[PDB]
Amino acid sequence: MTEYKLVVVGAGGVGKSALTIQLIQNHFVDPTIEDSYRKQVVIDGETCLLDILDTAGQEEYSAMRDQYMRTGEGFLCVFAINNTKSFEDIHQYREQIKRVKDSDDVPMVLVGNKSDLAARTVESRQAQDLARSYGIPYIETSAKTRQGVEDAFYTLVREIRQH
Ligand SMILES: Nc1nc2c(ncn2[C@@H]2O[C@H](COP(=O)(O)OP(=O)(O)O)[C@@H](O)[C@H]2O)c(=O)[nH]1
Ligand SMILES: [Mg+2]
């Protein structure tokens, strides 16, 4: 069976775990433990197996994180739309992924999470522009309402398929 190795990266607190648990278990929810989840799904008719690594356990740029990240095929790069720092951080996360995969074109999607919360501090247009300047998709999402959550992950699989 076709497996898709996915990795969820981004600043602590943006909703990585909430997005993953919503995708896998269909409900909304330890920010230090790092682990992988699996689930058999059908995407565009293809029955397949997602293997999802939920990163945590310190900002980033330890070799330990790379030891975990290196096995990933595609990356879900998440920020929170009310946390400007988490959005600035995407540049670094993207750089770290390119270095660990030793590639200039790694399957990746930008995810603006916490779409249910108002008074956003990152406008959609700006995030759409970042994704476009990177040549990757942008999906907005809420781990809380589930809006956009399948679109974000399934989109990542479609990027893996096309690379
Ligand atoms: N309102 C709202 N809160 C969220 C969302 N996603 C995560 N959270 C909350 O943000 C905090 C961090 O979420 P978590 O998934 O643990 O973030 P992580 O550190 O990136 O794994 C927790 O209070 C979560 O319940 C979301 O989409 N909407
Ligand atoms: Mg977490």
UniProtKB/Swiss-Prot annotation:
One of its GO terms (biological process) is positive regulation of protein targeting to membrane. A motif (Effector region) lies at residues 30-37. Alternates between an inactive form bound to GDP and an active form bound to GTP. Activated by a guanine nucleotide-exchange factor (GEF) and inactivated by a GTPase-activating protein (GAP). It catalyses: GTP + H2O = GDP + phosphate + H(+). It is an enzyme of class 3 (hydrolase). Widely expressed. Changing D35N: No effect on interaction with PLCE1. Changing G13R: In SFM; somatic mutation; shows constitutive activation of the MAPK and PI3K-AKT signaling pathways. The modification N-acetylthreonine is found at T2. Glycans are attached at T32. GTP binds at residues 13-18, 56-57, 113-116, 142-144. In its GTP-bound form interacts with PLCE1. Interacts with TBC1D10C. Interacts with RGL3. Interacts with HSPD1. Found in a complex with at least BRAF, HRAS, MAP2K1, MAPK3 and RGS14. Interacts (active GTP-bound form) with RGS14 (via RBD 1 domain). Forms a signaling complex with RASGRP1 and DGKZ. Interacts with RASSF5. Interacts with PDE6D. Interacts with IKZF3. Interacts with RACK1. Interacts with PIK3CG; the interaction is required for membrane recruitment and beta-gamma G protein dimer-dependent activation of the PI3K gamma complex PIK3CG:PIK3R6. Interacts with RAPGEF2. It is linked to Costello syndrome: A rare condition characterized by prenatally increased growth, postnatal growth deficiency, intellectual disability, distinctive facial appearance, cardiovascular abnormalities (typically pulmonic stenosis, hypertrophic cardiomyopathy and/or atrial tachycardia), tumor predisposition, skin and musculoskeletal abnormalities. This is GTPase HRas. It comes from Homo sapiens. The gene is HRAS.
